Design a protein around this ligand. Sequence first.
Ligand SMILES: Nc1ncnc2c1ncn2[C@@H]1O[C@H](COP(=O)(O)OP(=O)(O)OP(O)(O)=S)[C@@H](O)[C@H]1O
Ligand SMILES: Nc1ncnc2c1ncn2[C@@H]1O[C@H](COP(=O)(O)OP(=O)(O)OP(O)(O)=S)[C@@H](O)[C@H]1O
Ligand SMILES: Nc1ncnc2c1ncn2[C@@H]1O[C@H](COP(=O)(O)OP(=O)(O)OP(O)(O)=S)[C@@H](O)[C@H]1O
Ligand SMILES: [Mg+2]
Ligand SMILES: [Mg+2]
Ligand SMILES: [Mg+2]
Lengths: 139, 517, 517, 139
Amino acid sequence: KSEVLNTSRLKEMVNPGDVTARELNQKQESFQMTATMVAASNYNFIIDTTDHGTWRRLRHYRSKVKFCHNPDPSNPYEKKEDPRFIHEYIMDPDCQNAFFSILVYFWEKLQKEYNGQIKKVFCPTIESETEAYRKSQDT
Amino acid sequence: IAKVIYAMMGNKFVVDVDSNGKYVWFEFVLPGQPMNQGEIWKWRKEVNPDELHIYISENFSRVMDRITEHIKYHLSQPHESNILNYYKKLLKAFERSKSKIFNDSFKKGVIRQAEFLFRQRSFIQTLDTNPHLLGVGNGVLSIETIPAKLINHFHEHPIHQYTHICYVPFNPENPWTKLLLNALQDIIPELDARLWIMFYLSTAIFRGLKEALMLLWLGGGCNGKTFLMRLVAMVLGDHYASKLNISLLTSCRETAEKPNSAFMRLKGRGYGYFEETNKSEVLNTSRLKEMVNPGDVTARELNQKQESFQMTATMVAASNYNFIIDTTDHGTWRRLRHYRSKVKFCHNPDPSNPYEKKEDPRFIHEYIMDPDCQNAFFSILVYFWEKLQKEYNGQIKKVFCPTIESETEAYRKSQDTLHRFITERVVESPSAETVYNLSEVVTAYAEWYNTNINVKRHIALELSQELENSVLEKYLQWSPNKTRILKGCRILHKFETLQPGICEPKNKWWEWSPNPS
Amino acid sequence: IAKVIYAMMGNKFVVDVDSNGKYVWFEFVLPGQPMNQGEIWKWRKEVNPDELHIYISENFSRVMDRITEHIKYHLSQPHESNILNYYKKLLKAFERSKSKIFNDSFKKGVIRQAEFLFRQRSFIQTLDTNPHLLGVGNGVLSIETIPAKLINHFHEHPIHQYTHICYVPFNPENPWTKLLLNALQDIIPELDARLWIMFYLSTAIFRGLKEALMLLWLGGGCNGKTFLMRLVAMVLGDHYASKLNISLLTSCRETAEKPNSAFMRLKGRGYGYFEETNKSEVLNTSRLKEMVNPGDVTARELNQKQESFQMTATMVAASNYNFIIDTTDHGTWRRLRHYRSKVKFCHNPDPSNPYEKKEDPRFIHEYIMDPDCQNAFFSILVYFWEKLQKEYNGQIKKVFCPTIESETEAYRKSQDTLHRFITERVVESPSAETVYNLSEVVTAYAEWYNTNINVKRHIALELSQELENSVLEKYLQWSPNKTRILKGCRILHKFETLQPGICEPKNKWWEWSPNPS
Amino acid sequence: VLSIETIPAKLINHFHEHPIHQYTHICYVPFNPENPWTKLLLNALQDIIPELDARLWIMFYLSTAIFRGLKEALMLLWLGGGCNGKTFLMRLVAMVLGDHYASKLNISLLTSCRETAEKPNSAFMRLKGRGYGYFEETN
DNA sequence: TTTTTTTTTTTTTTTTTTTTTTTTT
DNA sequence: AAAA
Ligand SMILES: Nc1ncnc2c1ncn2[C@@H]1O[C@H](COP(=O)(O)OP(=O)(O)OP(O)(O)=S)[C@@H](O)[C@H]1O
Ligand SMILES: Nc1ncnc2c1ncn2[C@@H]1O[C@H](COP(=O)(O)OP(=O)(O)OP(O)(O)=S)[C@@H](O)[C@H]1O
Ligand SMILES: Nc1ncnc2c1ncn2[C@@H]1O[C@H](COP(=O)(O)OP(=O)(O)OP(O)(O)=S)[C@@H](O)[C@H]1O
Ligand SMILES: [Mg+2]
Ligand SMILES: [Mg+2]
Ligand SMILES: [Mg+2]
């Protein structure tokens, strides 16, 4: 369901800096994280803060397609599921090869255009959906 | 010597490095050698190659004597000063080396050296990967093609796990098979439900990817569900079937990350069953969807590091108490199935109780100890899986059964506290309006099922939208301050008042009948 | 050398690999050698074959001497130039090899080499598996056929565990047997109950699958329960009996924490007992029915992995505090039997108290360390087991005893909080209408026994169906809003105002009397 | 080694065959009331407990501490106040008997209020072979 | 209830081996 | 000087 969270080890992983913590059964060595984070859910996240910096390093979106097994013409923002589309199509290595090619091509496009600055690109939906969250989530 | 031995008996031994970095020897079993029951025509794990140790001391001696004989024969023929000293020195050195093969330190060194020669890269991780091969007492059974082929001869399949249940082709004429079929028909009266449940159970033989379906059905207190669960688990074997904790799904409790030996279960297993519950159990997403979907999952080796094991076993949960489900998502209530039994065995069965019969006290205490019973059950399961493959091509969701998915949807119409409150307290009484942002309604609903159903921590936002996920939002506009105030209801308390506002099989049912069945 | 040794005395030793992957040595004990008490005619576990080391260093010497005579005897007879050098060289080589056996490094390698020759596959897991064989002080006891036969000579039974109680044929004329029979009869005045209890205790000697039955009996505060409980365990031995903690059966709800050692009892133990409790306590748990049933169970013990073992033992729970039973499962009630003691030994026994006698201070403090007491008592139990097999063919449920199952069913009519409340506030006062939905009846029933009986987490199921599982459903309808509103009755919390609306044996009882008895 | 098998007790200071290994470092001598220490202890002991019958009964109970076999189930607890000298008597016996046969256990154990689940417990141990257990004051 | 006990080591080679120079062929 |  919906989850409540605020700065609870949030900014420590948000920033590209360095943190450190328990290492299984040891003390620590170092944590230089470089991985992109994504958190998709069907329940609204509860945030209770007004820090400008936290909202600065945040993005929000909301998809509008909810496929149905009985899709009528009156439902434009949904279609028919393919049960095998998730159950299979991942086992075929050719699918991963094609997806990897797509990812490499898109990364090269990003490097060519905005030179590695993800925030340099402009998307009307992006930020707008994020500031919409800012407009919300404020008791 | 290691090279000679590898060239000599090298097709029978395989050495591979374990997960801990220790070399392990595997032996290929053949008839006519000391062995455990049911371990024929397939590989086994060996601590040290003992029979290789006796082999290097027994069989190599004949080759040694052949070399000695050849040397002596060459010495016999007339020659020149070469046989004066060279042949004699070779004979002396070879004689001194002959006894070396018997030395224990020498033998250990030879074995350690030949570990590298017998090394075969990429062997452990490809063990039991084929799901169409199942280990059996009389060899290996292949279900890749219909009909399934029993292999009792030489092969090259990487099969090591097994069960000690000998396999025979499905023979309905067997007395034990007929008795089991009749008993199974009696336990579940409906033909269509019987067939559907048997087809679902036959999927436990397979070990590959399967459709994400969960079976959970109710039954009588003395129904006999646990008999079927224990029988299936016994027939499949420990390596493929294991008894998981019913509460596990009901209560996620500690995270999988937290040391869990049950998390090390479901790895390679083909069966996991839930025991009877002492009472009704509530569960929702408490490691539910993780066990539901067939995707690969991690593997927390108790206190050790975090592995990843693929899960494919069939999960079944049987109880005499219902289970509390608190959710509305269609996806969760689309990979579940429900059924209810109707047989409550009695030791004084009057004619006025057709939906029950006399117990057999020895039906559970014994009748599992007979190996013939497991053979018959295994044949039945194999035959049913073959029938499913023939008809629906492995698609369990494709088979139709009217009584099933009807009890399931009936259960879906139940186990919904929100609808009870709706068509108990507000519906049929819309002729008023008292709503404080539905917050009063949320609190009333919460306290209502706190005493009515159960007490638990609440979140205001869960009903902030679930109210619109009902028939309540038929009249809900909002004030200038929004507040989404409902436009009609009546908060009712106490008594108040009503204020204005299938076909029976002919002789055989295992024959499945034609496609309509 | 190892080949010669195995061909010479190889039948006396067996080498098998343990579960941990370490070779283990087993020696068969024969009379005429040192041994621990009660370890005759059966296999024993030995870390190092010490008797073998002295055997290869002493007994093997004479075989060496026979070689020494043979070579010189052939040397004595005149021959050609072969005896000039051949016999001389071999004799020098052999005498050099003579002293090699007395070396230590040489002997270590011999033992390691002989581990392959003496290896016997599938030997540990088939040890102590036959339930009809019991290790006794004077050999091994077989209860396969009536009468039970004691084997005290050579055999091939794979038996390793034992108890140190020497067996003698049952003699009722023995003074210890006479005293034990008299005291035991006085302990339980009822003949039929005495017959029923002894038969149940007789199954403890068995080590195979048994009828699922739980014994618990009540009575006097100082009856003498622990005397009989201690005697059976002491006689039947530690290897087959264990002290079981009551907290395991009375754990709150959790199945097990990640390690568990107490539950790993009953692995080979054929008997476990439960003692007096601090106070009346509830025991309705998962283990209430999970442990009692003959189905196999699995658990983990710390470093030991999470394996399974068949529960094979008889459970008895004697106390003076009545156990709080709260369930409606007829299956659970099947496993349980109840009895009440009626003897309270007193230090001032007057004739006006026939249901008691004088204590014997030395009855428990001593009379146990005497081996003859154990031998006589064990004979009594063994005789009973043969007798029970003769009459009821080893079926404990089919034995008849009028006083048992009568006090038990009277106990069943108790420990029913709901039924007690039924004829307390609503029944006998049905002429009113003050019954809302079942939630209010849940609350009303909850608050009653909250102080009258105990506090408990009142979940919905306690009356969501028990209303139909009662006598109050005769008038149970639902409104247009459903709600299952009862037709109503005088709830009337509290009770204010009125409510409107055997045969004594002649001289011997172990003779059991004829079949009716 | 001191033998209490037969009356009177006999001391073995020569060769024998009894498998005994544990001991205490207190030398044994025949009981002589004429020793100044024997009189000194007896006088103080007599003053500690005034009643003759109680004095006899208590010390007869404590005399069983030498024995190491099975004993009748008797629990002795008694009340005092202030500097009553109770600690003196328990402490004297413990060292006299020695650690191999006497030991001190947590007073909480006596309370029995604490309950132990499936978990290691050490204070329950140490009672093997001993013949004397003494406690102290509580909160 | 982790917690710390449990785990998990943790000795792991070591001796030896060979030679051994002398001896005695 | 080479083999034990
Ligand atoms: N086909 C059958 N013919 C004869 N007896 C049967 C048959 N099927 C079941 N029984 C008996 O009826 C009972 C089966 O129901 P139960 O086993 O009591 O129900 P359950 O689901 O197994 O829960 P349990 O076993 O009570 S914990 C057993 O006593 C069986 O021996
Ligand atoms: N048949 C008998 N003849 C003589 N004395 C007996 C007999 N049976 C029991 N006693 C004695 O009477 C007492 C038996 O009752 P209790 O021992 O007080 O009750 P209990 O169930 O044994 O509880 P505990 O464990 O002994 S405190 C013991 O002192 C026995 O020695
Ligand atoms: N028999 C005795 N002869 C001489 N002095 C004694 C004797 N018994 C007790 N005392 C004195 O009284 C004191 C003993 O009392 P305490 O040991 O203080 O009290 P307790 O009851 O043993 O427990 P504490 O120590 O007060 S918590 C010592 O300081 C002794 O000097
Ligand atoms: Mg059952
Ligand atoms: Mg007792
Ligand atoms: Mg003091």
